[PDB]
Design an enzyme around this catalytic site. Structure first.
Site, PDB file in Angstrom:
ATOM      1  N   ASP C  56      25.683 153.448  51.660  1.00 12.82           N
ATOM      2  CA  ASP C  56      25.314 152.426  50.637  1.00 12.82           C
ATOM      3  C   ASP C  56      24.538 151.256  51.258  1.00 12.82           C
ATOM      4  O   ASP C  56      25.118 150.540  52.095  1.00 12.82           O
ATOM      5  CB  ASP C  56      26.522 151.983  49.803  1.00 12.82           C
ATOM      6  CG  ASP C  56      27.772 151.666  50.601  1.00 12.82           C
ATOM      7  OD1 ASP C  56      27.754 151.868  51.829  1.00 12.82           O
ATOM      8  OD2 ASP C  56      28.758 151.222  49.983  1.00 12.82           O
ATOM      9  N   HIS C  58      23.376 148.478  49.679  1.00 10.15           N
ATOM     10  CA  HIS C  58      23.839 147.177  49.109  1.00 10.15           C
ATOM     11  C   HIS C  58      22.659 146.231  48.852  1.00 10.15           C
ATOM     12  O   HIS C  58      22.821 145.027  49.108  1.00 10.15           O
ATOM     13  CB  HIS C  58      24.995 146.555  49.910  1.00 10.15           C
ATOM     14  CG  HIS C  58      26.326 147.135  49.573  1.00 10.15           C
ATOM     15  ND1 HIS C  58      27.014 146.784  48.428  1.00 10.15           N
ATOM     16  CD2 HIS C  58      27.098 148.036  50.218  1.00 10.15           C
ATOM     17  CE1 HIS C  58      28.154 147.444  48.383  1.00 10.15           C
ATOM     18  NE2 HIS C  58      28.229 148.218  49.470  1.00 10.15           N
ATOM     19  N   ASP C  84      25.912 152.444  46.748  1.00  9.65           N
ATOM     20  CA  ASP C  84      25.549 151.259  45.928  1.00  9.65           C
ATOM     21  C   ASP C  84      24.422 150.491  46.623  1.00  9.65           C
ATOM     22  O   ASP C  84      24.544 150.241  47.837  1.00  9.65           O
ATOM     23  CB  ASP C  84      26.754 150.342  45.720  1.00  9.65           C
ATOM     24  CG  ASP C  84      28.036 151.096  45.412  1.00  9.65           C
ATOM     25  OD1 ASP C  84      28.066 151.801  44.386  1.00  9.65           O
ATOM     26  OD2 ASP C  84      28.989 150.973  46.207  1.00  9.65           O
ATOM     27  N   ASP C  87      23.558 145.524  44.023  1.00  2.00           N
ATOM     28  CA  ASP C  87      24.242 144.203  43.951  1.00  2.00           C
ATOM     29  C   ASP C  87      24.795 143.824  45.329  1.00  2.00           C
ATOM     30  O   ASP C  87      24.607 144.613  46.277  1.00  2.00           O
ATOM     31  CB  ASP C  87      25.338 144.185  42.879  1.00  2.00           C
ATOM     32  CG  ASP C  87      26.389 145.266  43.054  1.00  2.00           C
ATOM     33  OD1 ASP C  87      26.255 146.069  43.999  1.00  2.00           O
ATOM     34  OD2 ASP C  87      27.337 145.295  42.244  1.00  2.00           O
ATOM     35  N   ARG C  88      25.438 142.657  45.426  1.00  2.00           N
ATOM     36  CA  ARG C  88      26.026 142.194  46.714  1.00  2.00           C
ATOM     37  C   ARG C  88      24.975 142.332  47.820  1.00  2.00           C
ATOM     38  O   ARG C  88      25.284 142.957  48.855  1.00  2.00           O
ATOM     39  CB  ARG C  88      27.307 142.971  47.031  1.00  2.00           C
ATOM     40  CG  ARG C  88      28.407 142.112  47.635  1.00  2.00           C
ATOM     41  CD  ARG C  88      29.705 142.874  47.795  1.00  2.00           C
ATOM     42  NE  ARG C  88      30.181 143.441  46.542  1.00  2.00           N
ATOM     43  CZ  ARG C  88      31.283 144.171  46.425  1.00  2.00           C
ATOM     44  NH1 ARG C  88      31.949 144.542  47.504  1.00  2.00           N
ATOM     45  NH2 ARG C  88      31.715 144.530  45.229  1.00  2.00           N
ATOM     46  N   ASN C 116      29.408 153.220  42.255  1.00  2.00           N
ATOM     47  CA  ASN C 116      30.378 152.485  41.399  1.00  2.00           C
ATOM     48  C   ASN C 116      29.784 151.149  40.940  1.00  2.00           C
ATOM     49  O   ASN C 116      30.214 150.654  39.882  1.00  2.00           O
ATOM     50  CB  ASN C 116      31.717 152.278  42.109  1.00  2.00           C
ATOM     51  CG  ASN C 116      31.609 151.433  43.360  1.00  2.00           C
ATOM     52  OD1 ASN C 116      30.971 151.829  44.331  1.00  2.00           O
ATOM     53  ND2 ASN C 116      32.245 150.274  43.351  1.00  2.00           N
ATOM     54  N   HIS C 117      28.847 150.585  41.706  1.00  2.00           N
ATOM     55  CA  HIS C 117      28.286 149.253  41.353  1.00  2.00           C
ATOM     56  C   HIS C 117      27.200 149.392  40.283  1.00  2.00           C
ATOM     57  O   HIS C 117      26.766 148.354  39.765  1.00  2.00           O
ATOM     58  CB  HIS C 117      27.822 148.488  42.598  1.00  2.00           C
ATOM     59  CG  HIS C 117      28.942 148.003  43.453  1.00  2.00           C
ATOM     60  ND1 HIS C 117      28.768 147.673  44.780  1.00  2.00           N
ATOM     61  CD2 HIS C 117      30.248 147.793  43.180  1.00  2.00           C
ATOM     62  CE1 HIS C 117      29.919 147.290  45.289  1.00  2.00           C
ATOM     63  NE2 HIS C 117      30.843 147.348  44.327  1.00  2.00           N
ATOM     64  N   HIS C 166      29.592 160.137  46.274  1.00  2.00           N
ATOM     65  CA  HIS C 166      29.955 158.700  46.440  1.00  2.00           C
ATOM     66  C   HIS C 166      31.345 158.501  45.835  1.00  2.00           C
ATOM     67  O   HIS C 166      31.618 159.143  44.805  1.00  2.00           O
ATOM     68  CB  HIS C 166      28.926 157.789  45.763  1.00  2.00           C
ATOM     69  CG  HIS C 166      29.177 156.336  45.986  1.00  2.00           C
ATOM     70  ND1 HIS C 166      28.687 155.666  47.088  1.00  2.00           N
ATOM     71  CD2 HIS C 166      29.867 155.427  45.265  1.00  2.00           C
ATOM     72  CE1 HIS C 166      29.058 154.403  47.034  1.00  2.00           C
ATOM     73  NE2 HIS C 166      29.785 154.232  45.924  1.00  2.00           N
ATOM     74  N   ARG C 213      42.749 148.651  44.129  1.00  2.00           N
ATOM     75  CA  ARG C 213      41.987 148.380  42.880  1.00  2.00           C
ATOM     76  C   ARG C 213      42.455 149.385  41.823  1.00  2.00           C
ATOM     77  O   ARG C 213      42.684 150.549  42.184  1.00  2.00           O
ATOM     78  CB  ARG C 213      40.487 148.513  43.154  1.00  2.00           C
ATOM     79  CG  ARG C 213      40.042 147.842  44.445  1.00  2.00           C
ATOM     80  CD  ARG C 213      38.587 148.116  44.770  1.00  2.00           C
ATOM     81  NE  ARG C 213      38.284 149.539  44.738  1.00  2.00           N
ATOM     82  CZ  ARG C 213      38.317 150.347  45.791  1.00  2.00           C
ATOM     83  NH1 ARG C 213      38.642 149.875  46.982  1.00  2.00           N
ATOM     84  NH2 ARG C 213      38.021 151.626  45.647  1.00  2.00           N
ATOM     85  N   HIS C 240      31.478 154.918  49.666  1.00  2.00           N
ATOM     86  CA  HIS C 240      32.066 153.744  48.957  1.00  2.00           C
ATOM     87  C   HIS C 240      32.803 152.809  49.924  1.00  2.00           C
ATOM     88  O   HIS C 240      32.486 151.603  49.916  1.00  2.00           O
ATOM     89  CB  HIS C 240      32.955 154.230  47.802  1.00  2.00           C
ATOM     90  CG  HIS C 240      33.527 153.149  46.948  1.00  2.00           C
ATOM     91  ND1 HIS C 240      32.991 151.877  46.897  1.00  2.00           N
ATOM     92  CD2 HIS C 240      34.574 153.152  46.097  1.00  2.00           C
ATOM     93  CE1 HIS C 240      33.696 151.138  46.065  1.00  2.00           C
ATOM     94  NE2 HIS C 240      34.667 151.901  45.554  1.00  2.00           N
TER      95      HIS C 240
HETATM   96 MN   LIG Z   1      30.858 151.862  46.174  1.00  2.00          MN
HETATM   97 MN   LIG Z   2      29.637 149.789  48.243  1.00  2.00          MN
END
Ligand SMILES: [Mn+2]
Ligand SMILES: [Mn+2]
Lengths: 429, 583, 300
Positions: C56, C58, C84, C87-88, C116-117, C166, C213, C240
């Site tokens: 990922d 990011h 992902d 984002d972030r 997931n993002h 993922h 989570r 992830h």
């Molecule tokens: Mn992820």
């Molecule tokens: Mn991630």
């Protein structure tokens, strides 16, 4: 680095030479030692200093006249030299570039010693034998400004100690309150206009909140202008989430003292309404609701039209958190009472925005809240809801004529009917 | 009325709920004002601009720019003073950016003004702004003292000096910081006799001020005063100030002093520099703060360069070298990093004997240092040292380090040494490169970092353009043709890259004789990436190749590739055919 | 391959290489074309043997360029981005636009997997919507990308042996057929098979544990081994979870995690890793380091 001399227990020696041993101890602990380069070296010297400090904090409030005229300068001096040492640069934080929570706070390398010293100074101020009038000759404006400057350190604990000792100084010393307030105006102006980076804002806002809670007298012009040009401009900073609650508490406190200051605060908040940031929009809505709760109906009516206009603007936002917080305003019974009072003006603004976003949002909760609000409006008044409905459908068709006329006419008069056929020679490019 | 209609449309725009329309209107105000004409523009500007003030600060910023360039709309100097009142209210506003945009515009338009208008209108305006009861007005007025000074009369000059002194003596710090910043410019405008009479007392108060920011601004502004003052006077005028600044307890002031150390040395004078700045620099170099040490290391070279060559080397060997040696093994990354880049340029300055005696062991230590940052800087600047020390002596001293660093884990380090290889290849000769530096090039080529492989290919071209084509034909072509057999398709692409790069220097004859059949054989590879890259190389070598070979061997192959199932390959084969116009 | 469209894409990629964001209309056109291309894919996408699996990113653009240097360029080396990257991370819009524009060109060479993002609520809560609104002044770009995320494929199979996913396994899914019959084109469910698919992580406790989570469900080593044996998968790769080394062997070589984002949150100091697959389908790792990094909100 100096070798400490052999010392005895303070309680063991007679009270005759107890203060001589005490001022000698205040001189011995006045010496500092390195803690960031070689903390292994001078371990004996470090543990001796720690044992001395531990006896001192205990000695306080455990004996008669522990603090007296000759003791007042020595205690202030030892606290001053250790605390006022120049702060190191934020090398690893990179000037706190990373979020304050995300960035690791630089914990004092000698926190245990500092913690002990801060605890001792608080015990000194709180002690019954402490006299502000005797200490006012020695604690001066330079001490206050140095203490205020120190608020920029990272360790949250030492910041809390600084806040506590500042509150104690403000309470005990009546003569320095105006100077402290002035210096807090400056530390805030400099942060808002020049630096834009700081760590002690929350503690300073907490200190201000206690001062506002102690504003028993009707607010003087200085307090009013300070609220209108320090607290409200603080919402411009991007780090509002760091100290939001403190600023919220302060704003509500000022409005509780004087409700006549309500209209301007609302206009300042609407002017400083964030457009790009959502978290900031969230806290702005929170602040509005907190204020909305204490507003007198009269003051509310003065600014209901622009406040609800901004609210209708924010509802349209696709952001689900912003939409839910705006729609949660219908939970507070006071806001329901305010709209039942002012529906005739309030409904024609909220209604088109609520209808427009009735089906646009993707989130289920947002749609549920919008339908709940829609049902509430027709329940409180059926005829007014129908009138707003017919006006909305009329506007849905009249907007075409409005957009056609407004856009064409403005461009024409802007330059087509002016720059071209008037003063053509003077007109350039 | 003719004036009323543009004023009305602007009012309509200001009353419009949409801020974007208002912003577009104020951004397009210039043309609307062109229409008004001298007669109506000025009558519209005074009342309307006061009204515009009550709008978004973003809107205020828009007019700020517009006004700053509206000298043409006013008839000229005769009507420019009408622009002063709006700007004054725009400068005294709370927001910083609009205030800065206003003051700078005011400075720009101050020159166009006539001296009579300057004394009549501009001086009262600046007096009012300096006398304002709020700090924003004072900070704005800090920026207009210099521009209007040279054309006002002597009495007006004295009044301006008194107002500037009052502003410097202000209790508010924000005002003091603005005055300290503008002190240098004001001293530049001020006459030398008036500088000694008034600037020195105002400056000393700021240097001795308790606030650190005003202190660092003062020490930064001291450069201009040192420039204007005669050298004879600087000994008793600013030298106490410089000593106090260097010995200041705040590390920020020391850092600011260190950053501008070269400027102070240049301005003060080389002779006074060695007598009063060498112990100070030695103390600043050996400071308990990392940042001042880093700043000092940055100027280590400039300070040595600007020294009087009469005893420059003596000074360095006697005072600088001991400090550098101490600083080399410092337990901080930043100081070592900055010193490593700066230290190389000291080689020619030191006598040639001094380098071998002192710089080379310090360099070998910086090369062997675990820190990744220090070594990378040394290799990047390694180009200069070649001239100071004879190549045979230099190679013996650094080649041990070079051959160890050639396989350094960090790709960036390897990338730099690859770039520097051409220089050693040219200096040492072909025989030296073949005997020990060839295996390094091969291992560099077969490396798994793609950037390293591209750097190696570029290096290969750089050494072959000077080592002769026949040498590579008889030595490099057989070695590179072997790499094609590698099982990874990625390493096969390296062979294709080097075939493509060296074909230009080998020429058509050699390309057809030895590596063209290799490329043809490689074209039959199963991986589509290999077929895609073969087509690319065939397109590039097609102009180099003769037309008869193109038609005889390249055309039929490209025709087969165009019939390939992979849309990617077929497309590139078609592109290559079109580029070569074979079909 | 329209000649105009190909040169336009080449230009858009070149502009992006200089860290320059694309125009809104061009971005919308690119997203429309990518959606049209991706609508023909399935829940699982067949992937050739030689591929460079990437963790990922990011949305941090600078480290993404470093990755493109360490490995080959996209036209040169097949890339499997499975993580992902929306984002972030700063310049997220630049990162996601470059990835999409690289996907539309040479679609066979590079394949991207949904993470997931990619969820609308998750993109907004983690600092993407506000930054996109800052870089463009409108939410149209945000809605176009959320639609593109909804159309991303969930998982892919490499050569029929290496199963790259993922997130982690879900109790509901027992075979690839369950993933196939499922509908990839939907908004991620708050609770459901896709929610567990993109949020599950391996753990040493064993059995179908619960992640800290709520969305994910930790899977034991036994379940992973059973799924590998039933589905005939030599190894499963995931991105992830964050790993400091940038790679680890979670379940005795049954499952592997790759993380291609170095210096995570600018305080972890992690080093990124990339997986290398040759014509022999063997796996190798190479490490790198982050490249030297180079108005009020009310104001319009
Ligand atoms: Mn992820
Ligand atoms: Mn991630």
């Amino acid at each position: 680095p100096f070798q400490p001399v052999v010392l005895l227990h303070i309680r063991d020696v007679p009270p005759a030479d107890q203060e001589k041993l005490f001022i000698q101890k205040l001189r011995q602990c006045c010496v500092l030692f390195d803690f960031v380069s070689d903390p292994l070296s001078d371990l004996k010297w470090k543990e001796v200093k720690r044992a001395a400090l531990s006896e001192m904090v205990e000695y306080i409030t455990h004996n008669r006249n522990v603090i007296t005229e000759p003791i007042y300068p020595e205690v202030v001096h030892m606290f001053a030299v250790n605390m006022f040492r120049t702060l190191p640069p934020s090398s690893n934080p990179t000037g706190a570039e990373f979020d304050p929570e995300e960035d690791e706070p630089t914990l004092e390398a000698a926190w245990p010693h500092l913690q002990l010293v801060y605890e001792f100074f608080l015990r000194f101020l709180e002690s019954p034998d402490f006299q502000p009038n005797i200490a006012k000759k020695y604690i001066d404006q330079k001490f206050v400004l140095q203490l205020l400057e120190l608020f920029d350190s990272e360790d949250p604990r030492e910041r809390d100690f600084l806040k506590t000792t500042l509150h104690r100084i403000y309470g005990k010393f009546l003569g320095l309150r105006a100077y402290i307030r002035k210096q807090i105006n400056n530390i805030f102006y400099r942060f808002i206009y020049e630096t834009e980076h700081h760590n002690g804002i929350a503690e300073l806002l907490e200190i201000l909140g206690s001062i506002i809670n102690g504003f028993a007298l009707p607010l003087k012009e200085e307090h009013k202008i300070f609220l209108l040009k320090v607290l409200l401009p603080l919402h411009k900073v991007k780090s509002l989430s760091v100290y939001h609650p403190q600023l919220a508490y302060c704003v509500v406190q000022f409005l509780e003292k004087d409700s006549t200051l309500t209209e301007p605060v609302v206009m300042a908040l609407l002017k400083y309404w964030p457009k790009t940031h959502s978290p900031k929009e969230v806290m702005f809505l929170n602040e509005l609701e907190e204020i909305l709760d204490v507003i007198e109906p009269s003051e509310f009516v003065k600014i209901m039209e622009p406040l609800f206009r901004q609210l209708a603007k924010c509802v349209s936002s696709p952001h689900f958190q912003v939409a839910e917080r705006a729609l949660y305003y219908w939970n507070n019974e006071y806001i329901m009472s305010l709209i039942s009072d002012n529906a005739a003006k309030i409904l024609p603004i909220m209604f088109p925005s609520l209808y427009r976003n009735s089906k646009t949002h993707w989130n289920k909760t947002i749609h549920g809240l919008i339908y709940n609000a829609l049902k509430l409006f027709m329940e409180m008044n059926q005829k007014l809801f129908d009138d707003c409905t017919q006006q909305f459908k009329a506007e849905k068709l009249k907007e075409k004529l409005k957009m056609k006329e407004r856009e064409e006419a403005w461009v024409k008069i802007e330059n087509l009917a002016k720059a071209n056929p008037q003063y053509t020679v003077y007109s350039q490019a | 009325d003719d004036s009323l209609y543009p004023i009305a449309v602007l009012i309509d725009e200001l009353r419009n709920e949409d801020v974007q329309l208002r912003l577009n209107s104020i951004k397009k105000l210039s043309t609307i004002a062109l229409a008004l004409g001298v007669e109506r523009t000025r009558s519209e500007l005074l009342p309307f601009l006061t009204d515009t003030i009550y709008d978004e600060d973003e809107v205020l910023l828009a007019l700020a720019e517009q006004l700053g360039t509206f000298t043409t709309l006013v008839g000229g100097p005769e009507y420019v003073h009408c622009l002063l009142p709006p700007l004054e209210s725009l400068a005294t506003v709370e927001e910083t950016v609009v205030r800065d945009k206003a003051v700078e515009s005011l400075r720009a338009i101050s020159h166009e003004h006539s001296p009579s208008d300057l004394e009549a209108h501009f001086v009262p305006l600046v007096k009012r702004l300096a006398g304002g009861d709020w700090f924003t007005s004072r900070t704005s007025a800090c920026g207009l003292f210099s521009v209007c000074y040279p054309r006002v009369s002597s009495a007006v000059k004295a009044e301006l000096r008194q107002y500037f002194r009052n502003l410097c003596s202000d209790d508010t710090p924000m005002v003091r910081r603005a005055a300290a910043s503008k002190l240098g410019e004001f001293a530049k405008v001020l006459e030398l006799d008036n500088v000694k009479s008034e600037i020195i007392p105002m400056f000393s108060n700021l240097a001795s001020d308790e606030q650190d920011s005003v202190r660092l601004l003062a020490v930064e502004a001291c450069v201009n005063i040192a420039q204007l003052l005669p050298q004879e006077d600087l000994e008793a005028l600013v030298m106490p100030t410089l000593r106090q600044a260097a010995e200041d307890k705040s590390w920020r002031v020391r850092y600011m002093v260190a950053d501008k150390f070269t400027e102070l040395q240049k301005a003060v004078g080389p002779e006074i520099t060695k007598t009063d700045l060498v112990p100070a620099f030695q103390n600043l170099m050996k400071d308990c703060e990392a940042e001042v040490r880093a700043a000092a290391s940055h100027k280590v070279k400039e300070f040595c360069e600007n020294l009087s060559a009469d005893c420059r080397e003596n000074v360095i060997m006697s005072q600088i070298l001991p400090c550098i040696k101490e600083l080399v093994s410092d337990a901080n990354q930043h100081v070592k990093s900055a010193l490593a880049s700066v230290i190389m340029g000291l080689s020619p300055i030191l006598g040639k004997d001094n380098t071998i005696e002192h710089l080379l062991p310090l360099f070998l230590a910086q090369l062997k240092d675990e820190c990744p940052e220090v070594r990378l800087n040394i290799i990047s600047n390694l180009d200069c040292v070649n001239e100071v020390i004879g190549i045979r002596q230099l190679s013996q001293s650094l080649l041990p380090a070079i051959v160890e660093l050639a396989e350094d884990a960090k790709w960036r380090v390897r990338l730099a040494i690859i770039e520097y290889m051409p220089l050693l290849a040219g200096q040492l000769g072909v025989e030296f490169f073949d005997e020990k530096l060839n295996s390094l090039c091969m291992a560099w080529l077969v490396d798994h970092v793609y950037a390293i492989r591209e750097a190696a290919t570029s290096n290969l071209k750089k050494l072959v353009e000077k080592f002769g084509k026949e040498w590579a034909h008889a030595t490099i072509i057989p070695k590179v043709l072997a790499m094609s057999g590698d099982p990874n398709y990625l390493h096969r692409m390296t062979t294709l890259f080097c075939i493509n790069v060296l074909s230009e220097v080998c020429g058509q004859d050699i390309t057809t004789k030895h590596m063209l059949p290799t490329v043809l054989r490689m074209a039959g590879d199963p991986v589509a990436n290999v077929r895609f890259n073969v087509a690319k190389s065939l397109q590039k070598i097609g102009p180099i190749l003769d037309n008869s070979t193109l038609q005889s061997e390249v055309k039929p192959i490209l025709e087969k590739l165009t019939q390939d199932q992979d849309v990617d390959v077929k497309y590139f084969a078609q592109e290559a055919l079109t580029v070569l116009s074979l079909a | 391959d329209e000649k105009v469209f190909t040169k336009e894409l080449d230009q858009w990629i070149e502009q992006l290489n200089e860290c320059k964001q694309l125009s809104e209309s061009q971005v919308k056109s690119l997203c429309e074309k990518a959606k049209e291309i991706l609508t023909k894919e399935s829940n699982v996408q067949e992937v050739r043997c030689p591929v460079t699996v990437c963790g990922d990113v990011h949305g941090q653009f600078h480290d993404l360029m470093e990755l493109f240097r360490i490995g080959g360029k996209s036209p040169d080396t097949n890339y499997l981005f499975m993580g992902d990257y929306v984002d972030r991370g700063y310049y997220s819009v630049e990162t996601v636009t470059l990835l999409v524009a690289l996907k539309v060109r040479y679609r066979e060479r590079i394949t991207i997997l949904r993470g997931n993002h990619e969820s609308r609520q998750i993109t907004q809560v983690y600092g993407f919507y506000d930054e996109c609104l800052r870089k463009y002044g409108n939410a149209n770009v945000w809605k176009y990308f959320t639609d593109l995320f909804d159309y991303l494929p969930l998982t892919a199979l490499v050569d029929g042996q290496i199963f790259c996913l993922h997130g982690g396994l879900s109790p509901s899914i027992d075979t690839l057929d369950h993933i196939r019959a499922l509908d990839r084109l939907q908004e991620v469910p708050h609770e459901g098979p896709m929610c567990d698919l993109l949020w599950s992580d391996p753990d040493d406790r064993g059995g179908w544990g619960i992640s800290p989570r709520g969305a994910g469900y930790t899977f034991g080593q036994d379940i992973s081994e059973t799924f590998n044996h039933a589905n005939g998968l030599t190894l499963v790769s995931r991105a992830h979870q964050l790993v400091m080394e940038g790679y680890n062997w979670c379940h005795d070589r049954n499952v592997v995690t790759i993380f291609s984002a170095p210096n995570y949150c600018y305080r972890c100091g992690n080093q990124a890793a990339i997986m290398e697959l040759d014509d022999t389908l063997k796996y190798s790792f190479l490490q790198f380091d982050p490249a030297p990094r180079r108005t009020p909100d009310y104001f319009l």
